[PDB]
């Protein structure tokens, strides 16, 4: 996260860390959506142009964390994965369309003051909250600047940007399955997600029922916090049918 601030303890109990077994390192962010399911970005696991192709046995999911590098004894829970599901139509060759994946934990994790699932939006919540000008919140242990790492989880609040503005800021072909967020060069405020943050949640707090809903997944951007450029996020509601299908069938 660039230009954000340290998160308060228990501020994002659904934040998950994707951790590589060997060499032990942070791979990406993720989110807990139930006691046995984690949501993340597909490119965190599969991206052939960089010869990236991780399987269930290659990584661990760390939940309830705050500090990026410390093993938070009695606080965090480390889980093994049983199965990874990548969207059948994830487009890694062109624009990262449908950058989403589900991971099934080997065993359910117990909830606590630091571990709690986030809600998935329903059509009404999405239609009501996904509007230009409305702010969402992004969290992660990613890079603090394009070109180091934070000591604890970072957080930044960013406004959703009009689709035309998003499209006119890049050469990449943008689809209905993504939305972009960030401040405009003239708004006098900055902030963006960055490498290491992908897979993490973009959440919003509903003013109707006071619940936090994950509207997006950190997907991509060109650089980090560059003026005139915006962060792009996978549209979670747009892909909910596939999410429910995987959970129900498997």
């Amino acid at each position: 996260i660039v230009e954000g601030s340290d998160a308060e303890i228990g501020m994002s109990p659904w934040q998950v860390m994707l951790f590589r077994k060997s060499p032990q390192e942070l791979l990406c962010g993720a989110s807990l959506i139930s006691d046995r399911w984690v949501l993340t970005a597909a490119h965190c696991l599969l991206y052939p142009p960089w010869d990236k192709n991780f399987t269930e046995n290659d990584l661990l999911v760390r939940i309830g964390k705050h500090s990026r590098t410390r093993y938070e004894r009695n606080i965090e829970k480390i889980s093994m994965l049983e199965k990874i599901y990548i969207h059948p139509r994830y487009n890694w060759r062109e624009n990262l369309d449908r950058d989403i994946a589900l991971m099934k934990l080997k065993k359910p994790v117990a909830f606590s003051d630091y571990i709690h699932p986030v809600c998935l939006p329903d059509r009404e919540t999405a239609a009501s909250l996904l509007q230009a000008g409305y702010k969402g919140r992004v969290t992660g242990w990613g890079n603090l600047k394009e070109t180091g790492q934070p000591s604890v989880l970072q957080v930044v609040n960013l406004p959703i940007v009009e689709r035309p503005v998003c499209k006119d800021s890049t050469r990449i072909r943008i689809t209905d399955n993504m939305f972009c967020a960030g401040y405009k060069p003239d708004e006098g405020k900055r902030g963006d997600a960055c490498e290491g943050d992908s897979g993490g949640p973009f959440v919003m707090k509903s003013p109707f029922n006071n619940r936090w809903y994950q509207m997006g997944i950190v997907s991509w951007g060109e650089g980090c916090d560059r003026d005139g450029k915006y962060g792009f996020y996978t549209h979670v509601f747009r892909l909910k049918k596939w999410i429910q299908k995987v959970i129900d069938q498997f």
Binding site: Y71, I78, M80
Partner: peptide, 12 residues
Amino acid sequence: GDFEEIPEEYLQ
């Protein structure tokens, strides 16, 4: 910097 050693039970 680097990461702290995590229990071996999670590496098998």
